[PDB]
């Protein structure tokens, strides 16, 4: 195996010349992350190993 910067697509290229897209409101996933942060369950170690 080699570490060669596996690539994901940088942007959802939207087509259509008129209108608005269907992206989520800009404060929707931010409110979901904040709710998940409140549960304070983030896992960091697997048997002492990070």
């Amino acid at each position: 195996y080699k570490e060669t910067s596996r690539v994901s697509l940088t942007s959802m290229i939207y087509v259509g010349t008129a209108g608005k897209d269907l992206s989520l409101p800009t404060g929707t996933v931010e409110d979901i992350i904040g709710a998940v942060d409140g549960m304070r369950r983030v896992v960091r170690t697997i048997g002492g190993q990070t």
Binding site: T45, I46, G47, G48, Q49
Partner: protein, 45 residues
């Protein structure tokens, strides 16, 4: 005086032999090799 035929010194060789009654374990110098496991209270991956 008793002259006796002996074995000439150049036709024999002393060879050191190491006699053991059993093969020592892997952690031979360890009294408790099971204390690395009994003290893994977070787990082992």
């Amino acid at each position: 005086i008793k002259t006796a035929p002996v074995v000439p010194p150049t036709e024999q060789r002393d060879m050191v032999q190491e006699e053991r009654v059993g093969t020592p374990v892997k952690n031979a110098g360890n009294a408790n090799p099971a204390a690395d496991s009994d003290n893994a209270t977070e787990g082992v991956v």
